[PDB]
Amino acid sequence: DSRYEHVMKLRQAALKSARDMWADYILFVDADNLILNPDTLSLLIAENKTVVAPMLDSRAAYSNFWCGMTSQGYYKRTPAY
Amino acid sequence: DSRYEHVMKLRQAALKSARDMWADYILFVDADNLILNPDTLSLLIAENKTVVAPMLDSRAAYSNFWCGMTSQGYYKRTPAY
C-alpha cells in the first residue's frame, strides 16, 4: 500500500506542476513502454479528446486498456476486446 | 539616453519572461493610460492579429498611433489621420 501511495503522490505532483506552468497536454510515459512510431505524439494531439491512449502491442492478449469493470473495479472480458 | 536604455532593457526583460512561461498574449500597459472599457482585452483577443493596439482618446489630436515616418523615424501627418 505504501508503494501505491507513493505512486499516487508522485503522479499528482507531476500533474500539478504541469498546470502551474501553462502547458497544454501531458504525456505520461513509464520506464518499460517502447514508443516506436515517431509520430505518436502528433497523431494523439490531432484527435481532440481530453484523455486518449495509444494501443500498444505485446506478446500476449495483454495490452494497456480494459473493456469492463465487474463490481468493484476488476477486469471483465467484453466480447469487443 | 540612459533613461531610454533602461526602458529598453526593462521591456525586453518583460517580454523574455513572458516567453519562458508559456503564456500567449502580453498586454503592455503603462501608468497613465486609463483602460475604461472592461471588454478591451476580449475584443483585442478576438481580432487574430500579432500586434494590435486600441485607439485611446485624448483632449487634443494626440493619440497612440502614427500615420507616417518622414526619413529617419519622425511624425508626418497623413491625410488619413
Side-chain angles (χ1 to χ4, degrees):
Chain A
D1 257 314
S2 162
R3 197 157 139 152
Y4 281 153
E5 213 78 2
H6 195 58
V7 152
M8 321 275 287
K9 307 292 261 155
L10 261 173
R11 282 181 160 147
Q12 174 59 56
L15 184 46
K16 186 165 313 302
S17 165
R19 250 185 233 139
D20 311 4
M21 165 193 148
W22 278 353
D24 52 27
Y25 312 109
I26 167 179
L27 176 81
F28 275 117
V29 175
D30 72 347
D32 46 18
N33 287 6
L34 210 161
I35 287 302
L36 188 78
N37 201 342
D39 305 35
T40 289
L41 196 36
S42 177
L43 294 171
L44 295 193
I45 275 177
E47 297 222 340
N48 208 28
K49 322 271 194 210
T50 312
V51 180
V52 53
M55 174 205 98
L56 297 167
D57 311 64
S58 163
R59 62 163 176 96
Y62 183 87
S63 196
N64 68 304
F65 69 100
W66 292 3
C67 267
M69 322 205 88
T70 70
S71 152
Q72 52 252 47
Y74 264 147
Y75 186 44
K76 202 182 77 86
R77 163 139 309 171
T78 285
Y81 193 110
Chain B
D1 257 314
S2 162
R3 197 157 139 152
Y4 281 153
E5 213 78 2
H6 195 58
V7 152
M8 321 275 287
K9 307 292 261 155
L10 261 173
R11 282 181 160 147
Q12 174 59 56
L15 184 46
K16 186 165 313 302
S17 165
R19 250 185 233 139
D20 311 5
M21 165 193 148
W22 278 353
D24 52 27
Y25 312 109
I26 167 179
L27 176 81
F28 275 117
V29 175
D30 72 347
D32 46 18
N33 287 6
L34 210 161
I35 287 302
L36 188 78
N37 201 342
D39 305 35
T40 289
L41 196 36
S42 177
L43 294 171
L44 295 193
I45 275 177
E47 297 222 340
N48 208 28
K49 322 271 194 210
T50 312
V51 180
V52 53
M55 174 205 98
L56 297 167
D57 311 64
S58 163
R59 62 163 176 96
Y62 183 87
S63 196
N64 68 304
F65 69 100
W66 292 3
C67 267
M69 322 205 88
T70 70
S71 152
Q72 52 252 47
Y74 264 147
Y75 186 44
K76 202 182 77 86
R77 163 139 310 171
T78 285
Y81 193 110

